[PDB]
Coordinates of C-alpha atoms in Angstrom, one line a residue:
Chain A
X1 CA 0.0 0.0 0.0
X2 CA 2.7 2.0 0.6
X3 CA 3.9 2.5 -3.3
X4 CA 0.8 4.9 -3.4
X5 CA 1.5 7.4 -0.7
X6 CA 5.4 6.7 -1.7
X7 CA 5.1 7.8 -5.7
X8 CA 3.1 10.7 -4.4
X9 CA 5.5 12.1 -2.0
X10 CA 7.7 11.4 -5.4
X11 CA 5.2 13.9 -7.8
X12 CA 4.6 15.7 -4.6
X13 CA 8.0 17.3 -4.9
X14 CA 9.6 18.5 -7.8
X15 CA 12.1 15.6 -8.7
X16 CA 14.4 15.4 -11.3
X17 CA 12.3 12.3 -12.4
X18 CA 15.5 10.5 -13.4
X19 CA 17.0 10.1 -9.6
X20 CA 13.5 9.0 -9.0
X21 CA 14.4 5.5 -9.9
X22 CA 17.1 5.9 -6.9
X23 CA 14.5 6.7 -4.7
X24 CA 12.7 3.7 -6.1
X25 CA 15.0 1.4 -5.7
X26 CA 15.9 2.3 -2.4
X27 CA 12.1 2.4 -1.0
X28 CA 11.8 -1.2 -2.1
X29 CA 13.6 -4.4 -1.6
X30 CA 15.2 -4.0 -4.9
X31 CA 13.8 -7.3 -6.2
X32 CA 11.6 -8.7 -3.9
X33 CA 8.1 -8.5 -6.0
X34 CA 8.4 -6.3 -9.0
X35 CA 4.8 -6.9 -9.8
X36 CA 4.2 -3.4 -7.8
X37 CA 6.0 -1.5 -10.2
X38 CA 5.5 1.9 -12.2
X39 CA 2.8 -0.1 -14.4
X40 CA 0.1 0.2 -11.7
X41 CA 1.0 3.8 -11.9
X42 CA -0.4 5.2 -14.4
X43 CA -3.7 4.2 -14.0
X44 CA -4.3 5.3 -10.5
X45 CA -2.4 8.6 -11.0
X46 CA -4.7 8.9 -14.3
X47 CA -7.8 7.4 -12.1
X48 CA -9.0 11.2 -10.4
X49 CA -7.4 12.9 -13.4
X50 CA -10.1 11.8 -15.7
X51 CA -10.9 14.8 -18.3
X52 CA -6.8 15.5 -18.0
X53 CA -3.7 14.3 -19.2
X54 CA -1.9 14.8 -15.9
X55 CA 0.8 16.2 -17.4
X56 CA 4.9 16.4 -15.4
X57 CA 4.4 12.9 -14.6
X58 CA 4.2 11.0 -17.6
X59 CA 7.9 12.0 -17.6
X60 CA 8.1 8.8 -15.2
X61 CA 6.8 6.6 -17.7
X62 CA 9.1 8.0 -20.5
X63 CA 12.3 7.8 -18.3
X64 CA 11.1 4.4 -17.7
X65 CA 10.0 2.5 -20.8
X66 CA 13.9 2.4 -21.6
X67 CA 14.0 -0.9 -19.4
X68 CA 11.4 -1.6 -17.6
X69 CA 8.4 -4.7 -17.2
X70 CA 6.6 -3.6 -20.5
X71 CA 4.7 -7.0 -20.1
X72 CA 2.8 -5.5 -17.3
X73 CA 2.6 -1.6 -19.0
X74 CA 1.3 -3.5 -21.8
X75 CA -1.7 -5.9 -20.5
X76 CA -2.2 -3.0 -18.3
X77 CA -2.8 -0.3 -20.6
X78 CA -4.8 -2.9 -22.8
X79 CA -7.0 -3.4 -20.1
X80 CA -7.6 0.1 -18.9
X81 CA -11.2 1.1 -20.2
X82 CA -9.8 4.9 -20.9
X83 CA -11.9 5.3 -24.6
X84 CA -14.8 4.4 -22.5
X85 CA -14.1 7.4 -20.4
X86 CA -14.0 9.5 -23.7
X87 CA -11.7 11.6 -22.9
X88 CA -10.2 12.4 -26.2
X89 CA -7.0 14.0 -24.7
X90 CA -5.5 11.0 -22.6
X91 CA -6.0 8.8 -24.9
X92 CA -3.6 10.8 -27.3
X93 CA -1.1 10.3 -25.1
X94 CA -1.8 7.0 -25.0
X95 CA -1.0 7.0 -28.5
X96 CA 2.6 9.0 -28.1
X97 CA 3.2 6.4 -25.5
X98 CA 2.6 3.7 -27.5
X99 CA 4.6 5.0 -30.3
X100 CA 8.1 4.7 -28.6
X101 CA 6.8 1.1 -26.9
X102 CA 5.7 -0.7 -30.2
X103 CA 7.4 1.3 -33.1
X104 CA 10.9 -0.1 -33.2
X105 CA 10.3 -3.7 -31.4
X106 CA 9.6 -5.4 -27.7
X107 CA 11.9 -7.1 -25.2
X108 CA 12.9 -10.3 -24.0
X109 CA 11.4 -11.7 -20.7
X110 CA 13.8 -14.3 -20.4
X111 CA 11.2 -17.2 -19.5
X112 CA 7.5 -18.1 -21.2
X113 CA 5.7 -15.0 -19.5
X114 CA 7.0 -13.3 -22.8
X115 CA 4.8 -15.4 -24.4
X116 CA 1.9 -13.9 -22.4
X117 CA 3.4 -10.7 -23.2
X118 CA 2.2 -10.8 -27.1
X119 CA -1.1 -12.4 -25.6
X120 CA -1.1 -8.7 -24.3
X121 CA 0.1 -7.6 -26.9
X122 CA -3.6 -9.0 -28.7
X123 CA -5.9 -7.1 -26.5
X124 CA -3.5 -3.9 -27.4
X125 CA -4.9 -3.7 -30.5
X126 CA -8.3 -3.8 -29.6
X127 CA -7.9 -1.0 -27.3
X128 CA -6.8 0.6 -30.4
X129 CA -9.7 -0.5 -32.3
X130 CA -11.8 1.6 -29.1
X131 CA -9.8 4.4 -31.0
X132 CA -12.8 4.8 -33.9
X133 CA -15.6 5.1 -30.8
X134 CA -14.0 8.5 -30.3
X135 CA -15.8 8.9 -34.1
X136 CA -18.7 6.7 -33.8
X137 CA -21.1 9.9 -32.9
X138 CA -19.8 11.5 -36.2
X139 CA -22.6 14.4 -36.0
X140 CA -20.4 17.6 -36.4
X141 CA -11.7 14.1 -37.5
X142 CA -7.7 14.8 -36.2
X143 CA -8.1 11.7 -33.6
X144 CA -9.4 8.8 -36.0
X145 CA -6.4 9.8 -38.7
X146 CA -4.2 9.7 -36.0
X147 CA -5.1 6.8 -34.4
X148 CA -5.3 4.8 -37.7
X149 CA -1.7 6.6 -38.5
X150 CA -0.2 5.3 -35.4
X151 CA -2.2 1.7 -35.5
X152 CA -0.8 1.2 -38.9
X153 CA 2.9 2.2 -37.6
X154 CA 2.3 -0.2 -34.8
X155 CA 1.4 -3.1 -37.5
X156 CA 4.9 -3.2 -39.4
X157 CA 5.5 -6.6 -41.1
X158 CA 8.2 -8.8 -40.0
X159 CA 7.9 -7.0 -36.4
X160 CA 4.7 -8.0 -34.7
X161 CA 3.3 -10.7 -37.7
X162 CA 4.9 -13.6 -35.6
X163 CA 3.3 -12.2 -32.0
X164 CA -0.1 -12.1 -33.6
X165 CA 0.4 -15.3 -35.2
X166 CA 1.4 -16.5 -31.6
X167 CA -1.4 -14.9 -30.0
X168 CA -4.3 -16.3 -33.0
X169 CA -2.6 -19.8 -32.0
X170 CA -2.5 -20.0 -28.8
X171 CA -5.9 -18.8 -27.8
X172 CA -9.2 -18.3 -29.6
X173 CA -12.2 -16.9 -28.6
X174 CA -10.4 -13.3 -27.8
X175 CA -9.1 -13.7 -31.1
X176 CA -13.0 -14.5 -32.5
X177 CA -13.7 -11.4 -30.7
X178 CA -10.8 -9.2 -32.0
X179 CA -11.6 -10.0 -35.5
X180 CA -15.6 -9.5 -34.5
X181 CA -14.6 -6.0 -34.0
X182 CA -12.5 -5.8 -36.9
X183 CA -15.3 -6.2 -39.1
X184 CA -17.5 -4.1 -36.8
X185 CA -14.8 -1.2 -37.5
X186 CA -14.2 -1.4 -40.9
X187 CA -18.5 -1.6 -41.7
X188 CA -18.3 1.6 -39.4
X189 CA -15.5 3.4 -42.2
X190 CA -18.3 2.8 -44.7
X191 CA -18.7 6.6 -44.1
X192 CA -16.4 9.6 -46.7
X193 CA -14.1 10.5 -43.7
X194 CA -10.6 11.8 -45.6
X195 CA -9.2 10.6 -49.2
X196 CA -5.9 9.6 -46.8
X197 CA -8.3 7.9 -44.0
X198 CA -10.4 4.9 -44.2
X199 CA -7.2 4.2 -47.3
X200 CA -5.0 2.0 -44.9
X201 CA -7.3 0.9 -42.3
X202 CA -8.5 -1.4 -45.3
X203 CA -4.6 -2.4 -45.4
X204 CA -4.1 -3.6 -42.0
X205 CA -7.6 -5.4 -42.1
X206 CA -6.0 -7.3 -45.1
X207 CA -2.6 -7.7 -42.9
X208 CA -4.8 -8.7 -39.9
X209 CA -6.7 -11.1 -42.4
X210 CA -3.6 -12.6 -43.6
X211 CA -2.2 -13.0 -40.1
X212 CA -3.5 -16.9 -39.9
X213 CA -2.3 -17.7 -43.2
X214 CA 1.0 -17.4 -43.7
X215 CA 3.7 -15.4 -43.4
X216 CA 5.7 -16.7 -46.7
X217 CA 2.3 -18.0 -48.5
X218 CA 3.3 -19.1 -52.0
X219 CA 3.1 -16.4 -53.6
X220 CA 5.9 -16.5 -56.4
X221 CA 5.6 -16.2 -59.7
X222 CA 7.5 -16.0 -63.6
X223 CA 8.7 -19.7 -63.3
X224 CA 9.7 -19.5 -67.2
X225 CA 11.0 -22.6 -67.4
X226 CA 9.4 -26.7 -68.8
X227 CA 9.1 -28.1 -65.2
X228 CA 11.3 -32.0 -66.1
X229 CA 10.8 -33.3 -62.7
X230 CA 7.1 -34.5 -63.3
X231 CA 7.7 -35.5 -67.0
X232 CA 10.5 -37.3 -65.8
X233 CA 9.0 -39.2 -62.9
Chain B
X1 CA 6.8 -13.2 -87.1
X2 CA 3.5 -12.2 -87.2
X3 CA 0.7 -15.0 -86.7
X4 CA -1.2 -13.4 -83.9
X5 CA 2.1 -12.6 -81.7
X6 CA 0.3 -9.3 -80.5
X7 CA -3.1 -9.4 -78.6
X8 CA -2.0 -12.3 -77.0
X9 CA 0.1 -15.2 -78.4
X10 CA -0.4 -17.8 -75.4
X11 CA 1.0 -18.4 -72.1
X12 CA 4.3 -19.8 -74.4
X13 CA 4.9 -16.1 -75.0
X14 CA 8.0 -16.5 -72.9
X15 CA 11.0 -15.5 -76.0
X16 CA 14.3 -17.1 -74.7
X17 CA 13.3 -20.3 -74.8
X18 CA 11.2 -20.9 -77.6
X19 CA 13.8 -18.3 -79.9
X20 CA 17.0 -20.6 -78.7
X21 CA 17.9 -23.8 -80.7
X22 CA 19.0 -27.4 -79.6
X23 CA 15.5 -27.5 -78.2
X24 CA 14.5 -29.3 -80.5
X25 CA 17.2 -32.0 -78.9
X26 CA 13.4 -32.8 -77.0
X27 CA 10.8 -34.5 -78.9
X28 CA 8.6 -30.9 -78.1
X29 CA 9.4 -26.9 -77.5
X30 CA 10.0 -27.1 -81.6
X31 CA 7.5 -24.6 -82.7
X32 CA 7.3 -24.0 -86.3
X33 CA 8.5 -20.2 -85.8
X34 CA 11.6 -20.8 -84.1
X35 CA 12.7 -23.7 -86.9
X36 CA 12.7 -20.9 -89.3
X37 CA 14.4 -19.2 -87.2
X38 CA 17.6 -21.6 -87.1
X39 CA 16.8 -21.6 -90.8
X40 CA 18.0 -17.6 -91.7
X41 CA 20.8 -19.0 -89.3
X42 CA 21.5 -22.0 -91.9
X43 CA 22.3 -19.5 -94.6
X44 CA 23.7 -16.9 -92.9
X45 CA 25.9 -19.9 -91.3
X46 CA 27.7 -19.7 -95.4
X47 CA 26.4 -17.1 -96.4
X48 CA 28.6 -14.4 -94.2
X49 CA 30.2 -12.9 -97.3
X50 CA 28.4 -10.2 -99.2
X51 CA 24.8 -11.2 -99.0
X52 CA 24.6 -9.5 -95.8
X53 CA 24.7 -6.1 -97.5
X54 CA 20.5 -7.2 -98.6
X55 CA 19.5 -6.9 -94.5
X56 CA 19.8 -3.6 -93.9
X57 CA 17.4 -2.4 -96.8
X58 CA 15.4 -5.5 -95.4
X59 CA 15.4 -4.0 -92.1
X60 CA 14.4 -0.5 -92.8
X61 CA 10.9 -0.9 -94.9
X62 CA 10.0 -4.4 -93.6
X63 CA 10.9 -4.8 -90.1
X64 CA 9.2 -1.4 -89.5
X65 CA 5.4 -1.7 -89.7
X66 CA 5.4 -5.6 -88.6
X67 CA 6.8 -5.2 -84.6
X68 CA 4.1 -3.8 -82.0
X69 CA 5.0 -6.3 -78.6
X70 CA 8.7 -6.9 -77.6
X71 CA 9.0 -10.9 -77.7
X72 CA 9.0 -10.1 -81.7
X73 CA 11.6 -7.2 -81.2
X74 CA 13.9 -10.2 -79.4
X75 CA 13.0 -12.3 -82.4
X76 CA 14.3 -10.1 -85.2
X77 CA 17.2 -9.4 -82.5
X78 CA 18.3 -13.3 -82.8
X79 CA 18.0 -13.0 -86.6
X80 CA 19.9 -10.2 -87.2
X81 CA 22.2 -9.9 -84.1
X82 CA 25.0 -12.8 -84.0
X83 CA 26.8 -11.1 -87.0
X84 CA 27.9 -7.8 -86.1
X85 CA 31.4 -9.6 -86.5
X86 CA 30.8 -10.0 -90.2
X87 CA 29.7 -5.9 -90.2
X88 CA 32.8 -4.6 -88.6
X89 CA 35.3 -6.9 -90.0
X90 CA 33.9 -5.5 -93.7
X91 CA 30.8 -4.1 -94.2
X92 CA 31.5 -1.6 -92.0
X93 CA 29.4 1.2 -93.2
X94 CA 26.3 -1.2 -92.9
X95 CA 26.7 -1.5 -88.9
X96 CA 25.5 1.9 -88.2
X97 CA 22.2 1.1 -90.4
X98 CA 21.7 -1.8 -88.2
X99 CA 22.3 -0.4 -85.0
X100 CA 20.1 3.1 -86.2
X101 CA 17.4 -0.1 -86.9
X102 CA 17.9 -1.2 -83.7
X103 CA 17.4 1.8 -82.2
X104 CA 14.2 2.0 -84.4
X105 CA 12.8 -1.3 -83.0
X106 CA 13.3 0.0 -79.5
X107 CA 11.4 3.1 -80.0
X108 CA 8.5 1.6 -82.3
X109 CA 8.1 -1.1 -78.7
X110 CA 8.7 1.6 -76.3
X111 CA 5.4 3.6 -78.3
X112 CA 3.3 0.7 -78.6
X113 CA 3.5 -1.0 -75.4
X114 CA 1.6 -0.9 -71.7
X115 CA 4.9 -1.8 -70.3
X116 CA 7.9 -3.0 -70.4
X117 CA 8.6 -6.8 -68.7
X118 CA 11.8 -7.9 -69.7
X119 CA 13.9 -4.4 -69.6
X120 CA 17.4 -5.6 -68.5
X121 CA 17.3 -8.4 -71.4
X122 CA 17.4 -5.5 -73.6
X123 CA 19.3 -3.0 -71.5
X124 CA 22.5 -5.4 -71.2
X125 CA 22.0 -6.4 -75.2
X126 CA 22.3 -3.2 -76.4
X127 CA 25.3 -2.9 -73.7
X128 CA 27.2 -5.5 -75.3
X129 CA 26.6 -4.1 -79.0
X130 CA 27.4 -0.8 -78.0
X131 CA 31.1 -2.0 -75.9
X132 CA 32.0 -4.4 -77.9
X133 CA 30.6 -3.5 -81.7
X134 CA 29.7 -0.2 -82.1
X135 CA 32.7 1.8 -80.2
X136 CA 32.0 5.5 -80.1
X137 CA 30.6 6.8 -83.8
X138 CA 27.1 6.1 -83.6
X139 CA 26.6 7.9 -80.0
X140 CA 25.5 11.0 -81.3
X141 CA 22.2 9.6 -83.5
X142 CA 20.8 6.9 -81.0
X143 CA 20.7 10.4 -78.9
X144 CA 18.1 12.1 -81.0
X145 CA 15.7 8.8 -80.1
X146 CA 17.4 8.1 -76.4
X147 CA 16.2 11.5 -75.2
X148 CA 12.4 10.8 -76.1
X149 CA 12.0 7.3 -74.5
X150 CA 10.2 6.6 -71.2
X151 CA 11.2 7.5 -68.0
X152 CA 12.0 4.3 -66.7
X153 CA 13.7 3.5 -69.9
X154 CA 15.5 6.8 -69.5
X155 CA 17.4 6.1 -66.7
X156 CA 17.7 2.4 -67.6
X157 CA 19.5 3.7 -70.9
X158 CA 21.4 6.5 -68.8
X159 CA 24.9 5.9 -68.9
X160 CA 24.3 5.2 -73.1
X161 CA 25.0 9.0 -73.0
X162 CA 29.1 7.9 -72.8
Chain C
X1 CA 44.6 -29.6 -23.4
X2 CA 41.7 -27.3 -24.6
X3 CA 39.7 -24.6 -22.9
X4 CA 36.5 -25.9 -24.0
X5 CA 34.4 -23.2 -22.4
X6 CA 35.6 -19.6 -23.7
X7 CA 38.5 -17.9 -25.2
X8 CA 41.9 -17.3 -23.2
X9 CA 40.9 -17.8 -19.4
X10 CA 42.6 -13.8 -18.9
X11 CA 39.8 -12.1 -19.6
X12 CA 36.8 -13.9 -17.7
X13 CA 39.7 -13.8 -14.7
X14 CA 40.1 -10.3 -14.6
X15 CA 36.2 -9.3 -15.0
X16 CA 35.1 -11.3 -12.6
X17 CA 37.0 -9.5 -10.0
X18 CA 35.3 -6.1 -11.0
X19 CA 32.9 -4.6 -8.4
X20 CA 29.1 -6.1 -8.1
X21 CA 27.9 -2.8 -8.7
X22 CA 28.3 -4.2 -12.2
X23 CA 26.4 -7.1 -13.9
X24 CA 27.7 -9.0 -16.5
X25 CA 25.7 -11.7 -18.6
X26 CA 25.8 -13.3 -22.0
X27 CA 23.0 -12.4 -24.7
X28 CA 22.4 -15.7 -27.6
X29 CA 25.7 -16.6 -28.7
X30 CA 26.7 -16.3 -32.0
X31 CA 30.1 -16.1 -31.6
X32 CA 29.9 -19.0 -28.8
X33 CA 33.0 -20.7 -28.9
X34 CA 36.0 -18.1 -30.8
X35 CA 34.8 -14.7 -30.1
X36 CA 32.6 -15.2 -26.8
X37 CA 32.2 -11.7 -26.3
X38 CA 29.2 -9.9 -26.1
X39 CA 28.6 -8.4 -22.7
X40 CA 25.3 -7.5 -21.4
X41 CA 26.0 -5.2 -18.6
X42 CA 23.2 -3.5 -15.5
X43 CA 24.5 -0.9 -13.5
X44 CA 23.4 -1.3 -10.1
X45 CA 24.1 1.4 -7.5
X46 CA 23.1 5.0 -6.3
X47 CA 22.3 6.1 -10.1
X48 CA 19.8 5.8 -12.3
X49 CA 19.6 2.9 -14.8
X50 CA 20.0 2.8 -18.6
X51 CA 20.3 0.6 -21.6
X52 CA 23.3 -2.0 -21.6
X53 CA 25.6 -1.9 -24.1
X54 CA 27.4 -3.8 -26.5
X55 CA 31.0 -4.8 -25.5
X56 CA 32.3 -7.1 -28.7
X57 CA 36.1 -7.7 -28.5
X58 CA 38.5 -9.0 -30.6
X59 CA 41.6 -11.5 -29.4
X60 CA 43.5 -11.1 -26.1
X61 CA 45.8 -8.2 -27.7
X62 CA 42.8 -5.8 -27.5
X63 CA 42.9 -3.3 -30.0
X64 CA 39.1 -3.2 -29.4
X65 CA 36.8 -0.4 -29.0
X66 CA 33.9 -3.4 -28.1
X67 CA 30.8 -1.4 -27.6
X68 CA 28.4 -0.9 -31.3
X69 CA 25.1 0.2 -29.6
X70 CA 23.3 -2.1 -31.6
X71 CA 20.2 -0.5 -29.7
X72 CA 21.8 3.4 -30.9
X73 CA 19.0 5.2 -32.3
X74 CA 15.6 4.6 -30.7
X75 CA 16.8 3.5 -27.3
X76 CA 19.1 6.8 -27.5
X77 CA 15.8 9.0 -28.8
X78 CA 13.9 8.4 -26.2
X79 CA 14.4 11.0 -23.6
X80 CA 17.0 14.0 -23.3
X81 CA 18.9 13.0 -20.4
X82 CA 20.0 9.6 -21.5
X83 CA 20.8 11.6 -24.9
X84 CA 22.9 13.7 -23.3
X85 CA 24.2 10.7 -20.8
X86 CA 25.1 9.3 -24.4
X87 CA 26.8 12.1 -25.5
X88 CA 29.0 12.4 -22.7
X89 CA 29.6 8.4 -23.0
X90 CA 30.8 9.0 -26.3
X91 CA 32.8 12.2 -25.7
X92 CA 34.8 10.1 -22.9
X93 CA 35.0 7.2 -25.5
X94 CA 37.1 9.7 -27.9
X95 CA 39.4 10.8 -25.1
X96 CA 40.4 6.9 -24.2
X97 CA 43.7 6.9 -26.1
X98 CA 44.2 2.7 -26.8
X99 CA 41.1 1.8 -24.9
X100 CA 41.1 -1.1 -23.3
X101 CA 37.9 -3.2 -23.2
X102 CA 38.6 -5.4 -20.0
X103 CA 38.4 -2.4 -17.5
X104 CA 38.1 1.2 -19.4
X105 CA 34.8 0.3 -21.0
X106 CA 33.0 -0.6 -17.7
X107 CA 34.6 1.8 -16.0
X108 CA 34.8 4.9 -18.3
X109 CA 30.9 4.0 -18.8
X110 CA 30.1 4.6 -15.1
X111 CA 32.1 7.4 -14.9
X112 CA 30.0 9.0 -17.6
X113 CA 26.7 8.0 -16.2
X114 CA 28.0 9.5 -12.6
X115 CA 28.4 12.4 -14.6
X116 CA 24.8 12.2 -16.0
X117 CA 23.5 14.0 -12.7
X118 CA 25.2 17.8 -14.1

């Protein structure tokens, strides 16, 4: 209980946010159970902000995503019900956030949790999906073509493929759901958004599509050549 | 040269190995075309004298309106091309007529054509002729048909210019 | 007669009497049995923490500036403090004249993130 009151006292002063971790470190066992870390955090520090980003102390989780449990940051921020909220200012941070987790690649976890880790990794993209309710109303723009800008960084090939692949085939039914909502999202594009917009999210449905098929699916071609093997045999 | 050969031929349409001989070595891949092929060959195999001196006028009228695709431009290629030797050993003023024909094929394919699909073939052709039979006279002419080709063909052709 | 386990015995010999403020580990080895080098280091002390680095050397006569920073560019573009804790690293890194990757590395790399704190 005491990580609350003690990362207060930490945002109650003005710290350089970098010695922080020394204070960290030195108000915990320094290994005893790190499943009390940072990644609790940033949802109860977020929990009375509510229609504000809480700004100062998402310095914290920026000094920290360099090495950290992002297995934890991850499932947690997939499972935090912020676009319910509809707050349409957090949840842009979210996005920043996300950009320098995802964008280049994860991290090891040294044992099978890192498995569970791209199972997070799953429900991560649905909360993106959650990113097209801020548009649902659509009765009067900026956050869908950024959140389909940044959902479509987040789905480079040869990065994440394999996780999702390892995700579809180790579970199913939140996979049945994902692609439920998938559908669900792209019938709700159906509307003239942007000439850019509603382009690419057709593109990453295709990737998500081909996801359970293959990732080197025969798909060669210009084989000029009279194949002797079967005439042979 | 000209049965169908420009809507579309068949699926066979592939030119190296139905234009190469000793296929024939098979009991199939002997398509009529191609026999005649190796036929022109037969005579020009003796006939490398003087009798060359008739292609060049039977280049530049009748090779002209016949060629729309490129598998045909590779086909008149294989009939004309293995005898620059002949050209430059004596009927040197004849070589720049055949290269200036050349030239004319690859412009008549590069108008007439969605687009291109077998563009180094011809790129490192035309880069043998030009290093090894043409030397440096003809550069100036081929550049008054190089400058008006496609884009992509312009800077396939680029260092041409030397 | 064979070593069977790592290069020269010299080198594990003398790192192993460092200081346990430093944490030294092996990632996948691909150069398992003749290079055997690539460190993966965690500073552990009154500091704050960073990336690890690289640390490939090359036979016992050292003429090895080990670290590559395979992880450079977006582990380094992350926040402005490590920036800058890099470009001091690699300010430090110039001034080594024959650097020697045994000690100078390690140490030269604490020294610089000591000085991280202005």
């Amino acid at each position: 209980v005491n990580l609350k009151q003690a990362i207060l006292q930490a945002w109650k002063e003005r710290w350089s946010d970098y010695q922080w971790a020394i204070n960290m470190k030195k108000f915990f066992p320094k290994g005893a159970t790190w499943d009390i870390l940072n990644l609790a955090e940033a949802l109860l520090e977020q929990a009375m902000i509510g229609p504000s980003p809480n700004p100062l102390i998402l310095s914290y989780l920026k000094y920290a995503i360099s090495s950290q449990m992002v297995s934890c940051s991850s499932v947690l921020t997939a499972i935090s019900k912020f676009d319910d909220f509809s707050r349409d200012l957090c949840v842009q941070a979210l996005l920043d956030i996300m950009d320098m987790f995802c964008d280049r690649l994860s991290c090891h976890g040294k044992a099978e949790e890192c498995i569970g880790l791209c199972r997070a990794l799953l429900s991560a993209l649905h909360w993106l999906l959650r990113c097209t309710a801020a548009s649902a109303e659509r009765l009067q723009e900026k956050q869908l073509a950024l959140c389909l800008q940044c959902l479509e960084k987040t789905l480079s090939s040869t990065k994440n493929r394999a996780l999702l692949h390892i995700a579809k085939l180790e579970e199913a039914s939140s996979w049945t759901a994902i692609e439920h909502s998938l559908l669900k999202l792209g019938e709700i594009l159906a509307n003239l958004s942007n000439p850019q917009l509603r382009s690419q999210a057709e593109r990453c449905g295709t990737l998500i599509r081909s996801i359970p098929s293959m990732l080197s699916v025969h798909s060669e071609q210009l084989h000029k050549t009279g194949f002797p093997t079967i005439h042979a045999l | 040269s000209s049965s169908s050969l420009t809507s579309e031929t068949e699926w066979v349409g592939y030119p190296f190995r139905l234009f190469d001989f000793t296929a024939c070595h098979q009991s199939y891949s002997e398509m009529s075309c191609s026999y005649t092929l190796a036929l022109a060959h037969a005579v020009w195999h003796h006939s490398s004298i003087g009798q060359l001196s008739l292609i060049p006028k039977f280049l530049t009228e009748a090779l002209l309106p016949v060629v729309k695709t490129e598998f045909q431009l590779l086909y008149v290629y294989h009939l004309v091309g293995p005898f620059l030797q002949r050209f430059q050993q004596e009927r040197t003023r004849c070589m720049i007529e055949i290269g200036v024909a050349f030239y004319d094929m690859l412009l008549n394919v590069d108008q007439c054509s969605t687009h291109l699909n077998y563009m180094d073939p011809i790129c490192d052709f035309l880069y043998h002729m030009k290093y090894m039979f043409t030397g440096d006279s003809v550069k100036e002419q081929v550049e008054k048909i190089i400058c008006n080709l496609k884009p992509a063909l312009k800077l396939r052709l680029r260092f041409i210019t030397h | 007669e064979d070593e069977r386990q790592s290069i020269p015995n010299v080198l594990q010999g003398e790192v192993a009497r460092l200081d346990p403020k430093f944490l030294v580990n092996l990632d996948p080895s691909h150069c398992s049995n003749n290079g055997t080098v690539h460190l993966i280091c965690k500073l552990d002390d009154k500091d704050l923490p960073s990336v690890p680095p690289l640390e490939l050397s090359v036979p016992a006569d050292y003429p090895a500036q080990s670290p590559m920073w395979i992880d450079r560019q977006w582990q380094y573009d992350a926040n402005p403090f490590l920036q800058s804790v890099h470009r001091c690293m690699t300010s430090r890194l110039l001034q080594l004249p024959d650097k020697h990757s045994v000690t100078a590395l390690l140490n030269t790399w604490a020294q610089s993130i000591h000085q991280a704190c202005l």
